From Swiss-Prot, chains A, B:
Keyword rRNA-binding: no
Active site, UniProt feature: 97 (proton acceptor)
The protein's name in its UniProt record: Deoxycytidine kinase
SUPFAM superfamilies xref list: P-loop containing nucleoside triphosphate hydrolases
Upper taxonomic lineage: Eukaryota, Metazoa, Chordata, Craniata, Vertebrata
Length: 228, 228
C-alpha cells in the first residue's frame, strides 16, 4: 500500500528542492510535482501559463478559474502517480508537492480573503472541492511541513529569479505563513476533512540552506515514515 | 441494472413537462430534474440563482463559472439518483433532464462561440469535462430528443413567463436548435465520447401541445425502451 505524504510550506520554502532530493534517495520513493510549479517554467501547461499570467494581471477576474484548474490538475497528477507508480516497491512512499488541502485552505482561502473571489465563487469552489474530493484514495498518511520565515521565503523568491514573482510583497508571505502555522503547527485551522485533525505532521526548519547538507532532514523523514 | 435515458431539447421544448408526465406513469420510472431548471425557480440553489442572475448581467464574466457549476451540479444529482433510487424496480429507468453532453456540446460550446468564454476558459472547461466524466456510470442507454421549432420554443418561453427569459431572442433558439439537429438528427456533431455515435435516439415532434394528450408520445417511449 503506497504511503501518501504531502510536503507543505510557504512559497520558495524549498519544497521542490527537497522533493527532488527525496526522489533520488530510494527506488521506493516517488514525487508528484505541483502543477502550478510546472506552469511557472502540453494543453494543461498552455492553459496553466495563460491562467497564471492573467492571474498576475487581474486576480479578482481569474482566481476562481485558476484555483479550480490548479486543484483539478493536482488531483489528476496525484491519481496518475498513485495508479501508475511504485507497483514493485517494498516500502512505497509517494511525496506530494502540496495537497488539495493547501489549494483550498492556503491559496483559495487567501484569495477569498483578498476579495479576489466573491462569496458565490468561494462557496462554488468549496462545494466543488468538497464534492471533487469526497468521491478518496488521495487521503494523506502524513504531512511534512517545511517551515521557513517569511523573510527566508522572500530571499528564496529572489534566489529563484522568476520575473513575475519579484513583486510578491513580504505581507503576502506573512499571511500565507500565518495560515501554515494555524494549520500545521497550532492545528487551530478547522477543515472539512475530519481525518486531517489526527494526521501525523513532521515540522522541519529549513531556514538554513540544505541543498548540500540535507542528511539530518532526510534522517527525520525516515524516522517519521517508520512511525506511520 | 438502471437504464439511463437523457431527455434533450431546446429551451422550453417541454422537457420538464414531459419528464413530470413520465415519472407519474411507473414506479420503475424516476427522473433527475436539471439543476439549472431548479435554479430558475439550499447552498447549491443559492449559488445557482446568484450565478444565473450574474450570467444575465455579464455572460463574458460568468460563463466558465456557470457552466462548471451547472455540470458539477448535474453529475452530483445524476450519481445521487443512480445510487439512491430504483433499488426494488423490475425494469428500472432513470430519465435525465438533459445530460453532461448538452452542457458541453450545446450550452458551453455556444457560449465559447459567442466569445462569452475565451479560448483558455473553453479549453480548461473541456479538459475539466473530459476528466470529470472519464473517471463513468452515467453513460446513456438512449436519448429522447424532444424536437420543437425555434418559434414553438419562443412561444413556450412566453407561456412559462420567467421574467429573465422574455428577452431571449429567436436567433439564440435557432442557434441551439441547429446544434441539437447536428447532434441528435444528422449525428454530424463530433464529440469526445465514442459510444454516443451509436447510442439509440428517439426523436419526438412536440410542436403540438401534449400536456393533456401525451399517450402517443409515451407509447413511442415504451417501444423505444423495449428495444434497448
Ligand atoms: C507565487 C504566488 C503566485 N500566486 C498564486 N498562487 C496561488 C496558488 N494556488 C494554488 N492552489 C497552488 C499554488 N501553488 N499557488 C494562488 S495565487 C499569485 C498571487 C498573486 C497575489 C499576490 C499577493 C497579493 S497581496 O495580498 O499582496 N495584495 C493585496 C491586494 N492588493 C490590491 C494587491 C496586493 C495578491 O492580492 C490579490 C495576489 C497574484 C497572482 C498570482 C499568480
Ligand atoms: C434560458 C437561457 C439561459 N442561459 C443559459 N443557460 C445555459 C445553460 N447551460 C447549461 N449547461 C445548462 C442549461 N440548462 N442552460 C447557458 S447560457 C443564458 C443565456 C444567455 C444568452 C442568451 C442569448 C445570447 S445571444 O447569442 O442572443 N447574444 C449574442 C451576443 N450579443 C451581444 C447578445 C445576444 C447570449 O449571448 C452571449 C447569452 C444569457 C444568460 C443566461 C443565463
Ligand atoms: O536550501 C535551499 C532551499 C532552496 N533554495 C533556493 O530557494 C529557491 C526556492 O526553492 P524551491 O523552488 O524548492 O521552493 P518551493 O517554492 O518549491 O518551496 C530556489 O531558487 C532554490 O534553489 C536554496 O538555495 N537553498
Ligand atoms: O405541450 C406543452 C409543453 C409545454 N408547455 C408549456 O411550455 C413551457 C415550457 O415547457 P417546459 O418548462 O417543460 O420546457 P423545458 O424548458 O423544460 O424544455 C411551460 O410553460 C409549459 O407548461 C405547454 O403548454 N404544452
Ligand atoms: Na525514487
Ligand atoms: Na415513477
Amino acid at each position: 500500500r503506497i504511503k501518501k505524504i504531502s510536503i507543505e510550506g510557504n512559497i520558495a520554502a524549498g519544497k521542490s528542492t527537497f522533493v527532488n532530493i527525496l526522489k533520488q534517495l530510494s527506488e521506493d520513493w516517488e514525487v508528484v510535482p505541483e502543477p502550478v510549479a510546472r506552469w511557472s517554467n502540453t494543453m494543461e501547461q498552455k492553459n496553466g501559463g495563460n491562467v497564471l499570467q492573467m492571474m498576475y494581471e487581474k486576480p479578482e477576474r481569474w482566481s476562481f478559474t485558476f484555483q479550480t484548474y490548479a486543484c483539478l490538475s493536482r488531483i489528476r497528477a496525484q491519481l496518475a502517480s498513485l495508479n501508475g507508480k511504485l507497483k514493485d516497491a517494498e516500502k512505497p512512499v509517494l511525496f506530494f508537492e502540496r495537497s488539495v488541502y493547501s489549494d483550498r485552505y492556503i491559496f483559495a482561502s487567501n484569495l477569498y480573503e483578498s476579495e479576489s473571489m466573491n462569496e458565490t465563487e468561494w462557496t462554488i469552489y468549496q462545494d466543488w472541492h468538497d464534492w471533487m474530493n469526497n468521491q478518496q484514495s488521495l487521503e494523506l498518511d502524513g504531512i511534512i511541513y517545511l517551515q521557513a520565515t517569511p523573510e527566508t521565503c522572500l530571499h528564496r523568491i529572489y534566489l529563484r529569479g522568476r520575473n513575475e514573482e519579484q513583486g510578491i510583497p513580504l505581507e503576502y508571505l506573512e499571511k500565507l505563513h500565518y495560515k501554515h502555522e494555524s494549520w500545521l503547527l497550532h492545528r487551530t485551522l478547522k477543515t472539512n476533512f475530519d481525518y486531517l485533525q489526527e494526521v501525523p505532521i513532521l515540522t522541519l526548519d529549513v531556514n538554513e540552506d540544505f541543498k548540500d547538507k540535507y542528511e539530518s532532514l532526510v534522517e527525520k523523514v525516515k524516522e517519521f515514515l517508520s512511525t506511520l
